[PDB]
Amino acid sequence: MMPDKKGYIIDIDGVIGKSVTPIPEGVEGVKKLKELGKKIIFVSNNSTRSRRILLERLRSFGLEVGEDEILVATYATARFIAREKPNAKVFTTGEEGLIEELRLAGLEIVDYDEAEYLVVGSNRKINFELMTKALRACLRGIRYIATNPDRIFPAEDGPIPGTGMIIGALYWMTGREPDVVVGKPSEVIMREALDILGLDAKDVAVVGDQIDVDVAAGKAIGAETVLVLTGVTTRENLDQMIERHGLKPDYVFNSLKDMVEALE
Amino acid sequence: QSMMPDKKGYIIDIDGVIGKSVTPIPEGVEGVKKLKELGKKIIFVSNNSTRSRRILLERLRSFGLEVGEDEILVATYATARFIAREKPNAKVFTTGEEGLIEELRLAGLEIVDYDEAEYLVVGSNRKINFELMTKALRACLRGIRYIATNPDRIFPAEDGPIPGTGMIIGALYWMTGREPDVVVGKPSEVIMREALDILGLDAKDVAVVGDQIDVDVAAGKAIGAETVLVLTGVTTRENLDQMIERHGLKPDYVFNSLKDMVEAL
Ligand SMILES: [Cl-]
Ligand SMILES: [Cl-]
Ligand SMILES: [Cl-]
Ligand SMILES: [Cl-]
Ligand SMILES: [Cl-]
Ligand SMILES: [Cl-]
Ligand SMILES: [Cl-]
Ligand SMILES: [Cl-]
Ligand SMILES: [Mg+2]
Ligand SMILES: [Mg+2]
């Protein structure tokens, strides 16, 4: 059996690029998928970059990509809120790229005492007072959205905290988890992706480099899952990752290029 | 019971009882003076993870109290000595502030980076940042022995709730699945049994006095000591029933202030 579908939900980091640098076989793979006429949407959990920046990044990899072909957690979070409550007042722990999207969606950036929504995103400049403000917003009982649940972001010099750090802190202090988690493996971003694709899950494959994020995301919407080995998961650690995370992908390929070549 | 039975010793919380931050509570200060005149053994037990024993001694003396080193057991000191006893000169990595670092050094411990540490020591830090949390994460992931100064999730500061040391505990648990191996501060038995061992008294002869049901009353219950709640701090006459209900525990005695407890003997 081959992973031959009408549409593809494709993770960026570890599949198509690593930070600002392209993964050559990932790029080749996406180009050939596009040439075959498949519908593609890139889905990213990035909580600090705007849709604009990631579109520019993909184009710098040599890809032809339109606005509708990228769904990033910053944008998806802002949108989600704007649909619920146009011009909502939001207090955020997050960074400029998230703030950019919140503003583009018509939302008003305010302090915790004025907020209608608490929006948790990662912040490299997080500090004790921002955490105090988030704590108090939490205790006010206002609607609480998180951009993505990632506990640990796998970086080259080692693990660093993800948005999950703030989520964890707030849960421990108040007993409150987010009302809504947007990013993978949440169904929120995934179902929005299906919507944008205009396809049901049976006609979609979800492609990524993390079993706990991408494969779990596919499982959550009942789409077939493809794990590539160009990112976090390797030939060396594959069996251990399957064990650690408790899920097996439907397919494993060295890179996206190999997945596409399996369609011929 | 409106009257207080005569205990040989007292474990007394500071914040909300004797002072609020650097400001004395006159009825608390007077209560301590009177207990000392009665010849009762006293130890102040504080969950403060940012201040050294040196600084809290100075603070109590600034309230006009005559207090010795052995009469204060603060979580910074208690944590450092707990570790040093287990492993003299242990290498430690900490998230804490200068006050904790001071006590760790005074106990003979070596402050090192996360990759060399034998213990992870979690204390609150008002200058907490992403780099420090990265370091803590990595120390935590190594599986090394992990001690927390105190478990307080929320610290009841004068101008509204602020995060406690439990913020960092919470973050690390969520990211790694690990809770501290040992929690030192109240309501943990660790600091409380050390207090009993400084007093040279069994719990049956000691009352534990504080302003928080979830910390001070819980602490006394954990060692089987009678509990006294004063109303000079977090708990008030107005919110008392709400606090019993929220925290799920009843103190043995309630007095408006430490002075009133002492007068009821
Ligand atoms: Cl980035
Ligand atoms: Cl990304
Ligand atoms: Cl392209
Ligand atoms: Cl993240
Ligand atoms: Cl203080
Ligand atoms: Cl204190
Ligand atoms: Cl200090
Ligand atoms: Cl604290
Ligand atoms: Mg990835
Ligand atoms: Mg207190």
Q: Domains, chain A, ranges and CATH?
A: 1-84+183-264 (3.40.50.1000), 85-182 (3.40.50.1000)
Which residues in A lie closer than 8 A to residue B159 (C-beta atoms)? Answer: none
- Alpha-carbon distance A101 to A75, whole Å? 5
Asked whether the bond before A178 is cis by omega within 30 degrees of 0, the reply is no
- Alpha-carbon distance A126 to B125, whole Å? 13
Cβ–Cβ of A169/B164 closer than 8 Å? no
Mutation test of the interface with chain A: which of B49, B125, B126, B130, choosing the one with the most A Cβ atoms within 10 A? B130
- Alpha-carbon distance A180 to A101, whole Å? 17
Q: Is the minimum CB–CB distance between A126 and chain B shorter than 8 Å?
A: yes
Which residues in B lie closer than 8 A to residue A165 (C-beta atoms)? Answer: 133, 137, 171, 174-175
Helix (H) or strand (E) holding A39: strand A39-44
Gap from CA of B163 to ligand 6 centroid (Å):
16
Which residues in A lie closer than 8 A to residue B167 (C-beta atoms)? Answer: 131, 135, 169, 172-173
Q: Are B17 and B230 in contact (CB under 8 A)?
A: yes
Token pair listed for B179 = 């809770």
Gap from CA of A20 to ligand 1 centroid (Å):
8
Nearest chain B CA: its distance from A175 CA (Å): 10
Nearest chain B CA: its distance from A156 CA (Å): 13
Nearest CA in chain A to B135: A160
Nearest ligand for residue B76 CA: 7
Q: Is the minimum CB–CB distance between B133 and chain A shorter than 8 Å?
A: yes
Q: Which of A66, A20, A75 is nearest to A45 (CA)?
A: A75
What's the Cα-to-Cα distance from B119 to each of A169, B26, B104, B152, rounded to whole Å?
A: 21, 41, 11, 20
Q: Is the minimum CB–CB distance between B127 and chain A shorter than 8 Å?
A: yes
Print burial letters for B81-94: b (CB count within 10 Å at least 16), e (below 16).
bbbbeeeeebebbb
Asked whether the bond before A185 is cis by omega within 30 degrees of 0, the reply is yes
Resolution in A: 1.8
- Alpha-carbon distance B165 to B128, whole Å? 11
Query: Which alpha helices (DSSP H) does chain A contain, by range?
Result: 24-36, 51-60, 73-84, 96-104, 128-140, 164-174, 187-197, 216-221, 238-245, 256-261
Residue at token pair 């030939």: A235
Token pair listed for B22 = 């650097």
Nearest CA in chain B to A167: B171
Nearest CA in chain B to A162: B175
Which residues in A lie closer than 8 A to residue B96 (C-beta atoms)? Answer: none
Number of H helices and E strands in chain A, helices first, is 10, 15
Residue at token pair 């939490």: A138
Cβ–Cβ of B170/A173 closer than 8 Å? yes
For the packed helices A96-104 and A51-60, what is the interaxial angle rounded to 10 degrees? 110
- Alpha-carbon distance B4 to A258, whole Å? 80
Q: Are A89 and A114 in contact (CB under 8 A)?
A: yes
Nearest ligand for residue B21 CA: 5
Gap from CA of B141 to ligand 4 centroid (Å):
17
Q: Is the C-alpha dihedral spanning B214, B215, B217, B223 positive or negative?
A: positive
Which residues in B lie closer than 8 A to residue A151 (C-beta atoms)? Answer: 174-176
Strand B72-74: give its sheet, edge to edge.
B72-74, B41-46, B9-12, B206-210, B226-230, B253-255
Q: Is the minimum CB–CB distance between B161 and chain A shorter than 8 Å?
A: yes
Nearest chain A CA: its distance from B65 CA (Å): 33
Gap from CA of B56 to ligand 6 centroid (Å):
7
Q: Are B242 and B232 in contact (CB under 8 A)?
A: no
Residue A249 CA, chain-centre distance (Å), reads 18
CA-CA-CA-CA dihedral for A237, A243, A248, A252, to nearest 10: 10
Which residues in A lie closer than 8 A to residue B128 (C-beta atoms)? Answer: 127-128, 131
Token pair listed for A231 = 């990112």
Q: Is beta strand A251-253 parallel, antiparallel or unpaired with respect to A21-22?
A: unpaired
